Design a binder for this molecule. Structure first.
Ligand SMILES: Nc1ncnc2c1ncn2[C@@H]1O[C@H](COP(=O)(O)OP(=O)(O)OP(=O)(O)O)[C@@H](O)[C@H]1O
Ligand SMILES: *[C@H]1O[C@H](CO)[C@@H](O[C@@H]2O[C@H](CO)[C@@H](O)[C@H](O)[C@H]2NC(C)=O)[C@H](O)[C@H]1NC(C)=O
Lengths: 100, 49, 335, 49
């Protein structure tokens, strides 16, 4: 079937034996991919990816707000007040360590 | 904005006119500014309201 | 001037008035239903406002409680170091000002509970306030988790995106007049068990002298076994044979212009991706039906796989078709 | 031996004399903006649209 061999592309197969709709749409009015779309992809993930995104999200939130807290405990003149080892913590009580 | 604050402080001290560390910071500021420019341009250029 | 309103606006959304309807009132169940069905830009606000208001209100109550027992009064007059203050009947250890009471709330409800602020068993009012705060916190938390999850669960669906052709065509097929419109799709999941229906709506009389201003007269979609179901993966042309038993018999192109009429097309099916029923509708008015403009093919023959297009959806090439009636169409078939 | 964000010389983090007029706070604030960018970016680019 050499004619069919060169005719492997010419073929009336509207739907593949698997079941999909082998077709081709084009020239359509793609308005965009609005934000909420990404969230839907979050629902339809697989277990390995869902577990990864889960753990990564928790850890990212923790680290980020920890960095923020670090800045906060810096600006209030707190880290220095602790670093003063005249005593175990000589004047660390009155200075109102912002976070004990 | 963080870099601008850094540059003004880098300013008052006036460690040097060309003391190297002041020189670098300045370079980083301008490229940043150029990037701000592109963001504004891209907003107008593509869909903007 | 204003034309009589279409029983169906072009995009859908039947625009008919509704006057002298007895009020059904309202119910708080309805307020909850309004809450669940919000959109994010307001859920992530009503949620936050509920939380912040809850915390602030309970903090105010805490401040009052720490006021009555004189917690504040004992704390402020403190001697050098501390002999008088610690041992007396404080009600909530280390609350001495509003901001402090605020922190005590935010440590009680959200369940942080550091420990600098301990509560003793000496003031029954304090025990009742703690119980009430905790119960309120659990109820608010449960309902907000429910709402957030309901959005995360039912956001698997989107706005109905179905596209009908703009116009309609009265054409010739199989040596007979015919009616055609185009129904396509831009969605992903093929509609399951789809059905299509066509209804002509026009004012009619009844020979025993009675009128019915907006009749509805279902009319048969052509199909080789007369089955309203229809498969759709590429744009289709839902046809309509015309016969002396069909309600369009008495129209030619000459009489089309100033004619009171309409066609409503409603098709329904269950999307399988979202597993939910849906129906879409359109409506063509007298002036919107370009006679004789037989439809333009779309599907082509690419090498491996067929292909379609969408820029040329409503291209109406025009061909000769009789400019005459349908009754007269079978009256004179000579030439 | 402890690592020092601002160097270990004692009391070199004595932030009196103006809240932001210290030789170290500028760097830290600049790092904060960079850390924020990385965290948000990683979470939205580990899924994709
Ligand atoms: N290529 C396409 N992409 C998206 N929608 C289409 C396309 N072709 C047709 N349609 C839909 O079919 C309907 C009729 O389209 P038609 O071919 O009449 O274009 P039009 O209405 O003349 O121009 P427009 O679609 O810009 O209003 C439109 O409402 C449109 O939504
Ligand atoms: C920490 O130590 C340094 C020295 O390593 C100090 O800076 C200088 O130390 C001298 C005393 O040797 C003091 O006069 C000044 O503080 C500095 N030099 C001057 C001004 O002569 C300082 O205590 C700390 N580091 C800094 C910020 O200089």
């Amino acid at each position: 079937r050499k004619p069919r061999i060169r005719d492997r592309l010419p073929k009336a197969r509207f739907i593949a034996k698997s079941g999909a709709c082998n077709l081709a749409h084009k020239n359509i009015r793609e308005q965009g991919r609005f934000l909420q779309d990404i969230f839907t992809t979050l629902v339809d993930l697989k277990w390995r990816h869902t577990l990864v995104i889960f753990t990564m999200s928790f850890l990212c939130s923790w680290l980020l707000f920890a960095i923020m807290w670090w800045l906060v405990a810096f600006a209030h003149g707190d880290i220095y007040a602790y670093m003063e080892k005249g005593i175990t913590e000589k004047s660390g009580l009155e200075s109102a360590v912002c976070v004990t | 904005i963080t870099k601008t604050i850094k540059l003004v402080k880098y300013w008052q001290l006036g460690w040097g006119m060309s003391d190297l560390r002041f020189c670098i910071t300045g370079v980083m500021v301008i490229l940043n500014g150029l990037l701000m420019a592109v963001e504004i341009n891209v907003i107008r250029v593509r869909r903007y309201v | 001037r204003l034309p009589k309103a279409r029983f169906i606006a072009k995009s859908g959304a039947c625009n008919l008035a509704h006057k002298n309807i007895r009020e059904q009132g309202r119910f708080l169940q309805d307020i909850f239903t309004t809450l669940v069905d919000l959109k994010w830009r307001h859920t992530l606000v009503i949620f936050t406002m509920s939380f912040l208001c809850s915390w602030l209100l309970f903090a105010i109550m805490w401040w009052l409680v720490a006021f009555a027992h004189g917690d504040i009064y004992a704390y402020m007059e403190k001697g050098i170091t501390e002999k008088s203050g610690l041992e007396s009947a404080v009600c909530v250890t280390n609350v001495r000002s509003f901001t402090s009471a605020f922190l005590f709330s935010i440590e009680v409800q959200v369940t942080i509970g550091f420990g600098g602020r301990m509560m003793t068993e000496e003031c029954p009012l304090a025990i009742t306030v703690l119980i009430l705060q905790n119960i309120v916190g659990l109820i608010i938390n449960a309902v907000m988790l429910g709402c957030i999850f309901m959005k995360t669960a039912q956001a698997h669906r989107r706005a109905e995106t179905l596209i009908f052709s703009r116009h309609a065509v009265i054409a010739v097929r199989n040596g007979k007049l015919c009616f055609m419109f185009r129904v396509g799709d831009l969605r992903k999941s093929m509609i399951i068990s789809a059905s299509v229906r066509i209804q002509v709506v026009k004012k009619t009389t009844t020979p025993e002298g009675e009128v019915v201003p907006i009749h509805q007269q279902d009319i048969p979609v052509d199909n080789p076994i007369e089955s309203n179901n229809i498969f759709l993966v590429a744009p289709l042309i839902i046809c309509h044979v015309i016969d002396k038993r069909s309600p369009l018999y008495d129209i030619s192109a000459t009489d089309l212009v100033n004619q009171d009429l309409e066609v409503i097309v409603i098709l329904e099916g269950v999307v399988e991706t979202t597993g939910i029923t849906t129906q879409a509708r359109t409506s063509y008015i007298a002036e919107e039906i370009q006679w004789g403009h037989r439809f333009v093919s779309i599907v082509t023959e690419e090498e491996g796989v067929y292909s379609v297009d969408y820029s040329k959806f409503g291209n109406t090439v025009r061909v000769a078709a009789p400019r005459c009636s349908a009754r007269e169409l079978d009256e004179k078939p000579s030439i | 031996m402890s690592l020092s964000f601002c160097g270990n010389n004692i009391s070199s983090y004595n932030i009196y004399h103006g809240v932001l007029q210290n030789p170290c706070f500028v760097d830290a604030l600049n790092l904060v903006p960079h850390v924020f960018l990385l965290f948000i970016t990683f979470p939205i680019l580990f899924i994709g649209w």
